[PDB]
Design an enzyme around this catalytic site. Structure first.
Site, PDB file in Angstrom:
ATOM      1  CG  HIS A 163      -6.886 -10.372  -6.241  1.00 55.85           C
ATOM      2  ND1 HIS A 163      -7.960  -9.549  -6.501  1.00 55.85           N
ATOM      3  CD2 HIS A 163      -6.362  -9.950  -5.067  1.00 55.85           C
ATOM      4  CE1 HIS A 163      -8.075  -8.663  -5.528  1.00 55.85           C
ATOM      5  NE2 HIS A 163      -7.119  -8.883  -4.645  1.00 55.85           N
ATOM      6  NE  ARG A 164     -12.936 -13.368  -2.611  1.00 54.61           N
ATOM      7  CZ  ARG A 164     -13.742 -13.877  -1.679  1.00 54.61           C
ATOM      8  NH1 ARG A 164     -14.492 -14.944  -1.937  1.00 54.61           N
ATOM      9  NH2 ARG A 164     -13.802 -13.313  -0.481  1.00 54.61           N
ATOM     10  CG  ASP A 182      -3.573  -3.302  -3.504  1.00 53.90           C
ATOM     11  OD1 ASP A 182      -4.504  -4.126  -3.602  1.00 53.90           O
ATOM     12  OD2 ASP A 182      -3.605  -2.335  -2.711  1.00 53.90           O
ATOM     13  CD  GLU A 183      -7.033  -4.886  -5.765  1.00 52.99           C
ATOM     14  OE1 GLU A 183      -6.742  -5.619  -4.793  1.00 52.99           O
ATOM     15  OE2 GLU A 183      -7.411  -3.707  -5.625  1.00 52.99           O
ATOM     16  CE  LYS A 193      -3.552  -2.725   0.572  1.00 48.25           C
ATOM     17  NZ  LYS A 193      -4.718  -2.854  -0.339  1.00 48.25           N
ATOM     18  CE  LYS A 208      -2.826 -10.218  -3.056  1.00 49.73           C
ATOM     19  NZ  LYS A 208      -3.265  -8.918  -3.541  1.00 49.73           N
ATOM     20  CE  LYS A 217      -7.088  -0.653  -3.863  1.00 53.49           C
ATOM     21  NZ  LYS A 217      -6.793  -2.071  -3.522  1.00 53.49           N
TER      22      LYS A 217
HETATM   23 MG   LIG Z   1      -5.833  -5.603  -2.943  1.00 52.02          MG
END
Ligand SMILES: [Mg+2]
Ligand SMILES: O=C(O)[C@@](O)(COP(=O)(O)O)[C@H](O)[C@H](O)COP(=O)(O)O
Ligand SMILES: O=C(O)[C@@](O)(COP(=O)(O)O)[C@H](O)[C@H](O)COP(=O)(O)O
Ligand SMILES: [Mg+2]
Ligand SMILES: [Mg+2]
Lengths: 455, 456, 160
Positions: free
Chosen positions: C147-148, C53-54, C26, C51, C28
């Site tokens: 990741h959903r 962030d998406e 973060k 990970k 994001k």
């Molecule tokens: Mg995320």
């Protein structure tokens, strides 16, 4: 030249080298050639030619180089024993994915040192790979578990897979070939190409693959049971291997997961094995070791043992490898070879010198083959202790007096006899196909069951 | 089981089998294991297990199968000799291009028969390939001629290419590695990776290749001469081999034709050799045979000889292969090994048992390596008869008392000495680098040239 | 690939190897390559797993290759400092199959001997099963992190 002060450190403790996890260990039976250096001098030169050095001093050597020297840490001249520790930093890694390659392990540990003039002979009997190096190997992606699933067997201890090899080794045209497949499949589970079968002019690859695909459908329709085939896709050319594998899978279509790929891994080399393992990870990789006997034979005092070969094959990612009949068939082997099977199937096992933790790396199936038949199986299983494996009997199946189908059933019943702990001759009275194997191989029957005829 | 009636036909004539051009012939030294069948019985089973049969009768065998049976056609039990004729129809071919594969030749001729329980040992000493089968092999696409051209030498009999191997075998980091390359190139032509060198964590592949590329440019600018490097691109993964080769050629750019690719062909296998041969046909393919001694050693009575290995390598398409020092270096070898060199270089040559016509297939260079130095070279050239080859001396160059550059020049001068037909010790009087090789390797000098000190 | 392969890298038991301490970088979006990599190093001093962030990938203010290189450096520094193995899950999601391959291939080459410390994240719900399968079949030896993002549009109990 004496390089013992540099390349030998017998004060090192094996338990600490293992605990450190920064070294590959190798155990050799070596003998110096007469007229050169003593045992430790020879071992020191052996280590130099297997890691960082040569046969003379070079000014280009620095302390960083000496830091990654391989080292002889244990010797026993009386027993011709030599143990060497290789820093794992020595071994080559892929640029593309940072993974290990068995080719580098071979080049260093059993490469140029096999040509040394001051060495009469040297053979690797065992090796240890630590976690940091072990985890970088592909390992098997497909196992016997996936074959059991297709056969509708339990995925844990799914039991014995009845197999054969299409005989003649070469000479059958596509439809006669496929006809033999169908016949065996009426009673058996698994069929493999004989190791040289592929795209012979009298048996074109695509025609044979199509005919076999038809035979599989016909056998499965007739019996209502799933059938398996292991196709030889070995080639010099990577792209030929891909072409063969791709054609087979498209052709078998809804039966594509019934297909294993056979690779002649010893003669075609690790490169061929890896081609199949990485291109077709979802297809059972069947490692055939034709030619291996040139070094693995106890008659040979060079190269490496079958145990070493088998352990390497598990790292390379073979789903199964031939481990031999352990003295019970036509090929060279000893009953003690059962240890090879355990090393490739278990998560922890002992070699002749080193204990190996596999850290959950998938097992490799022991594939049993070489002059086996129904009569010889009870003895084999007694020595091994289980039947969670594939056994292929070519002559043992198609040499049955009543044909390939009857041959298959005799193999099935032979394992059933061993699991039931019954007496083979007494068991035969209620199982015709098994009984007819006695008449099929009377020379074998006389040896194993002296008075089988009377009973 | 006796299968001699089927798989043995001693009435066949070798000259006719050769004339027919339908059979691969193989000569073995074999010994039956005690307690089994006699010599011809054992040879018959051997043939069965190497072609069409197994250890028992199978109902599936038909007359067509018997037609393609391999056959033992000549035996001499007193000398443990066994010759087998393999119908060429037996050998596998590529679906994609109808060409041959050495993997099939190996599987049949020296495969399962090496594990037979009724055989104590069996080793192939020679083989013959007829035109119909020979023409189906790749053969070499690049030769020494292409190296001569880069060096500005005559493309016919361009002469001796002075080479070395970077030593330490492993341990040099990228820039120290490249520094050694530069030094040698001040006096030499050719450098090869030591066989295990690649992408070690302390010597990353791309960093080393870049540093070597810089060294080549600097050395060529300094000397005004072309320089060559042979990079190890051996890997289990076909795609790793491609990645390495592709990166090297892009990096060297206008010096890309100065690059050879080294493949550890024995341990990685024919599949790795063919990857390089077919992916990079315009780059000199350098076959390194590490591990071969496990079977080729005369101490071994199994597998095949180095002669057989070398002949196979030419078919596979090696531009050059190590043929050994023929008894003059540190590895096992005999003076008679000169015959191997002739078999891979000439258009027609004799093996221990079979004459071979190569039908214009390109030659494979004899690469001479293994404990060589300036002192041992005159004797080696005397046995071979020519110096149209690559010789690499790692210890022989970097072990020189005056360093790698002086090491290179001592090798250069050693071949010039042989070419001029001069006496080495007398020649040394007027050639310092060569003379300093005596002081560098005194044990060798004492043995090879008694009283050299007195004369120098 | 399963958590077992992550456990193995961490030096944990491959059966019930236990808890993997993780985070997401973060902000994001908004961190440039080196500030991004600095945050990675900081967390890795106490944690195992990081990970993307998406949505993090190849934003103009944080180019993909520059970020991957910086993170790779951070992993080495953190592993040298702590003497423990560290993991990263990279977003390789794209519309174009060949963009996914390009991202994955570059990451693995860059991380080199730390390549088995890498997971690939795919925004499987919005990019679709096709994107998931690209990663699964192209990189079977790398942990596939599904990741959903977006799933709540249907999975929410508020939706019928
Ligand atoms: Mg995320
Ligand atoms: O060609 C053969 O001889 C076989 O098909 C066996 O045929 P049979 O069943 O008819 O004897 C197998 O390849 C050998 O078992 C290989 O030996 P290993 O398993 O020891 O590697
Ligand atoms: O690693 C080595 O030992 C060499 O680099 C020679 O180095 P030196 O010049 O220092 O001896 C070569 O690989 C061997 O000659 C290979 O043997 P062969 O040519 O017989 O295959
Ligand atoms: Mg076979
Ligand atoms: Mg070498």
């Amino acid at each position: 030249m004496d390089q013992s002060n540099r390349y030998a450190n017998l004060n090192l403790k094996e338990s600490e080298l293992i605990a450190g996890g920064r070294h590959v260990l190798c155990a050799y039976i070596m003998k110096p050639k007469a007229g050169f250096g003593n045992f430790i001098q020879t071992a020191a030169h052996f280590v130099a030619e297997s890691s960082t050095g040569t046969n003379v001093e070079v000014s280009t050597t620095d302390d960083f180089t000496r830091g990654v020297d391989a080292l002889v840490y244990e010797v026993d001249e009386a027993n011709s024993l030599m143990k060497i520790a290789y820093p794992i930093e020595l071994f080559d890694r892929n640029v593309i994915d940072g993974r290990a390659m068995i080719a580098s392990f071979l080049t260093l540990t059993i490469g140029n040192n096999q040509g040394m003039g001051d060495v009469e002979y040297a053979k690797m009997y065992d090796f240890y790979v630590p976690p940091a190096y072990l985890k970088l190997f592909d390992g098997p992606s497909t196992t016997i578990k996936d074959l059991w699933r297709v056969l509708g067997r339990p995925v844990i201890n799914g039991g014995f897979i009845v197999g054969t090899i299409i005989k003649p080794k070469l000479g059958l045209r596509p439809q006669p070939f496929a006809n033999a497949c169908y016949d065996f499949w009426l009673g058996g589970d698994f069929i493999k190409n004989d190791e040289p079968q592929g795209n012979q002019v009298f048996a074109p690859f695509k025609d044979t693959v199509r005919a076999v695909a038809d035979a599989m459908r016909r056998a499965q329709d007739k019996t209502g049971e799933a059938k398996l085939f292991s196709f030889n896709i070995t080639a010099d050319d990577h792209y030929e291997m891909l072409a063969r594998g791709e054609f087979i899978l498209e052709t078998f279509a809804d039966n594509a997961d019934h297909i294993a790929f056979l690779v002649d891994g010893y003669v075609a080399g690790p490169a061929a094995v890896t081609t199949a393992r990485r291109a077709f990870p979802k297809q059972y990789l069947h490692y055939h070791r034709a030619g291996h006997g040139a070094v693995t034979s106890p008659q040979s005092k060079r190269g490496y043992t079958a145990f070493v070969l088998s352990k390497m094959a598990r790292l390379q990612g073979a789903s199964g490898i031939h481990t031999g009949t352990m003295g019970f068939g036509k090929m060279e082997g000893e009953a003690a070879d059962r240890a090879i099977a355990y090393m490739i199937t278990e998560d922890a096992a002992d070699g002749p010198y080193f204990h190996q933790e596999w850290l959950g790396m998938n097992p490799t199936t022991p594939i049993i083959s070489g002059g086996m038949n129904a009569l010889r199986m009870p003895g084999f299983f007694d020595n091994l202790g289980h039947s969670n494996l594939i056994m292929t009997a070519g002559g043992g199946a198609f040499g049955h007096v009543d044909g390939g189908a009857a041959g298959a059933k005799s193999l099935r019943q032979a394992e059933q006899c061993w699991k039931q702990g019954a007496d083979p001759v007494e068991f035969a009275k209620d199982h015709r196909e098994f009984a007819r194997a006695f008449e099929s191989f009377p020379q074998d029957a006389d040896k194993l069951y002296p008075n089988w005829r009377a009973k």
